Amino acid sequence: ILSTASVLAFERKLDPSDALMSAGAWAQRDASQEWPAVTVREKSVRGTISNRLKTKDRDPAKLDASIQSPNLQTVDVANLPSDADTLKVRFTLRVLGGAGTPSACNDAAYRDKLLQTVATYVNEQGFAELARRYAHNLANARFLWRNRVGAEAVEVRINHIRQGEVARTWRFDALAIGLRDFKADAELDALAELIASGLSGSGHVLLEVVAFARIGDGQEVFPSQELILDKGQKSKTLYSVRDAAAIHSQKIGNALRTIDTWYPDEDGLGPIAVEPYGSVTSQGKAYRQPKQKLDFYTLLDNWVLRDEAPAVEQQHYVIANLIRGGVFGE
Amino acid sequence: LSTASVLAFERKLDPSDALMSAGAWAQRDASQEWPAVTVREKSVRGTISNRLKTKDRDPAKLDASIQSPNLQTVDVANLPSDADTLKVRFTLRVLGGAGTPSACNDAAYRDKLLQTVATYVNEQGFAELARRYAHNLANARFLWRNRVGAEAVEVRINHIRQGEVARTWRFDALAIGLRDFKADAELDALAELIASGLSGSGHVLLEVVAFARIGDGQEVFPSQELILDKGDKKGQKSKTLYSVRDAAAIHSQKIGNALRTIDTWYPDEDGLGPIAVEPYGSVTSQGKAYRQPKQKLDFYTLLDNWVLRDEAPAVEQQHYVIANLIRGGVFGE
Amino acid sequence: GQICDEALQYAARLRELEPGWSATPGCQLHDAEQLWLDPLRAQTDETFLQRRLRGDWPAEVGNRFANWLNRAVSSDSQILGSPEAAQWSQELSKELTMFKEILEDERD
Amino acid sequence: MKKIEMIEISQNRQNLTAFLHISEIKAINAKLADGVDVDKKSFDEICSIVLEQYQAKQISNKQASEIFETLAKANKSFKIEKFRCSHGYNEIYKYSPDHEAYLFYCKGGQGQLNKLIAENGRFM
RNA sequence: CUAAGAAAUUCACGGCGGGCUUGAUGUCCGCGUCUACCUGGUUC
């Protein structure tokens, strides 16, 4: 007799913050601490009817009477200044450690076997495989989602803060490091070992991450956008913290855990964010189907209940979405 | 093989908002510190000239309209009284990766679409679309109502590699037409540059300046903002103008519409001229739609003919599909 | 026809019942309803107070009421493409045509 | 396949006509009875005929399972459900066709979900 | 030239003692707002 508890919850490790945007000139990015913020303004927009209309009602009368109707929309837009060409994005990140221990549980035997399974994992192999992939997703600039496409140069600065002062600095070139491979450098492995020590409880780390992207004078940046509930009525609004455009923290947290490449469909497509029934929202489909046996909710209770440990590349997936958090069980 | 339920294509050839300034000719080569034009306020007393219901009986609705004072308050942008030209400046960048969708459901549909665009680029280059995009840059068509009546306009284009200038082009936009797409001896270099940007082999950032000699204190026309009813009889109740934080300016979508006036393959007439690339390719200033689905030259119908059932259309209008896949938008059911 | 009369009685008894009408919140925008369904002059009657809403043309209120009525009666290509939406618009036009004559005999 | 899965797979899909290739039409005709025939048909009537034949003690379970497997491969459109329950977090969301998404409705679990399904109807 | 004509509901009052609401999250793609105007209202 052994079964899954009714309520089982996990808090998250790797808590990021929001990312405020700011604007300045390239080759002044060393003194980039008094640069002004990128603000959100509004503008008006009208356009024709261009959606794929239904063929049950497709006559020239409707197509010429739909043009004269006046469509006025108010949109939120965020640009760079006319004399600046570099976007700076800054946030902080702290990893916590204590990943296999739940925040709530019901059975007394289930948590004592889950802790033993996770401790057996950590004793067999450390957090050295997940941490280099997290440091890879920090090393390039995947947290810049659409601000990264088409940029001339990207540069990332990472500080380690252990008092009210810095302790270690890193500088990377985010376009030399791809978005496809996971290869090991000598400077990247120090950061990998640092955030591997942070995930094991053997220290307190707090990183400050800055990214510079060179796009061009007066060009359009893309902050995160909000939800509006409802003749010139606003149809798009953008997220903002005090007089500054921003990106949500959950979007950067999604861009950080694009880790797994062990899903059975392909590997030339590249990495996928770690989710149960691993699913891409822009693609519309769901890899790791429960008809196959490469789920979180199948590998987890085959590993814990029936003592059938999966392959080594598939244990990183279970530990990755235990690090992610959430409510499992019933 | 059906069509995907969602399909989204990102925009290539994205410009910024063009800012306006004023100076003098024979000083336009030193036009970096010119003062920028401001949006000013004035008053207008309105006389009724609207077409009422014809054969009106009394003067109680017409001779009493004169005694009722109308009060309007308008925004106007004027040149100074010592300046006789208008400088309009913006930047542009072309991306590449034109046939790859931003979001789609079907996995076997983009396997057809990507190889369709692949064999299009393999058969014909991007040069035919690029030389007409460079033509629309070369004339000052992004100046909509500031181009009319001007005695001399000219266009400077700088190719920007780093914080410097890689290549300069200087044109005369009245010596080349707004109606004909004919070859030149220097414009083909700009065409090859933006075709290399459109194909993915490098990145391209252009800066476009346009000088227009209008007159000593005339009126320029920036974009017009959609006004709300939260103002009094004074307080911009009638006409407000778009100004980006310092000075009057044109929207970016107006210049984007002025840069894709490229296609001349619509079967209405061979002398009417080019229009902008739209599905059901329409004009708002004219009110007339073209390319209806009654005819078969509509984008959705021939796209489903080309991609699904291998009905490759005519080559002279195969550039229309790629011209409105470069434009970007929301397609699919 | 019943829905028009309920709004007429609500305008006649709601603003006309309470003996007070101060400045609206956002007077540059809250002045159309404060001018049409608003009371006569009061203690705060300035120079351009009793010579603005009684001397101006009180005929924009009919189109403003028709703009509110257009939301309630739903229109689309299912009705506008058929011949019943034209009569459904003409009935509202014949109803709101008296909205300027019966709703414009007070000031003018 | 169980019969509960049969009425589930019959009700949650749209009604489509001409959704079959002719190879699958003769494949289904090889697996149905002698007398009845389906041609130029929609989904529902096929579901009703095979349900009536399985209610009769005449058609076997592997054969109706092949029929419902073929109907499972063929039909690709589903009906959008009106309510959706997020189970660990105890929340109920309601579909809004203007946003093309599910918005937050109330707090509750399976009993409250069955209550609003019985009150408002299951599908859109 | 009224379902007409007529009429006191009153006196007093202690609501009250305790408490952990929690755990995760990608809002995305695209757009042409144009043409006209004497405030010599009595901005008392």
Describe the protein's architecture and organization:
- This is part of a larger assembly, with 2 copies of chain A, 1 copy of chain C (108 residues) and 1 copy of chain D (124 residues).
- With 330 residues, chain A is α+β, with helices and mostly antiparallel strands.
- Helices cover 24% and strands 22% of the residues of chain A.
- Chain A has 2 domains: 1-11 and 99-126 and 259-330, no CATH class; 12-98 and 127-258, no CATH class.
- Chain A has helices at 60-68, 108-124, 128-139, 187-199, 249-256, 296-303, 312-324; strands at 7-10, 15-16, 19-24, 41-45, 73-77, 86-94, 153-161, 166-173, 207-214, 234-236, 240-241, 244-247, 258-260, 272-273, 326-329.
- With 108 residues, chain C is mostly helical.
- With 124 residues, chain D is an alpha+beta fold.
- Chain D contains 5 helices and 3 strands; from the N terminus they run H-H-H-H-E-E-E-H.
- In chain D, helix 1 packs antiparallel against helix 3.
- The longest helix of chain D has 14 residues, at 61-74.
- The radius of gyration of chain D is 18 Å and the shape is elongated.
- The chains are: A alpha+beta (330), C mainly alpha (108), D alpha+beta (124).
- Chains in contact: A-B, A-D, B-C.
- At the A-B interface, strand 4 and helix 1 of A face strand 6, strand 7, strand 12 and strand 17 of B.
- The PDB classes it as immune system/rna/dna.
- The entry lists the keywords complex, immune system, IMMUNE SYSTEM-RNA-DNA complex.
- The entry is titled "The Csy-AcrIF14-dsDNA complex".
- Chains A, B: CRISPR-associated protein Csy3.
Shape descriptor of chain C: elongated
- The end-to-end span of chain D amounts to 27 Å
Q: How many β-strand stretches of chain D?
A: 3
Order of helices and strands of chain D: HHHHEEEH
Helix share, percent of chain C: 40-55%
- Structural class by sheet pairing and helices of chain D: alpha+beta
| Secondary-structure element series of chain C | HHHHH
By secondary-structure content and strand pairing, the structural class of chain C works out as mainly alpha
Beginning-to-end CA distance, first to last residue of chain C: 25 Å
Strand order of the largest sheet of chain D: 1-2-3
**Portion in strands of chain D:** 5-15%
Q: Biggest sheet of chain C: strands, sense, closure?
A: none
Strand content of chain C: under 5%
How many strands in all of chain C? 0
Regarding quaternary structure, what we see is: part of a larger assembly
Radius of gyration of chain D: 18 Å
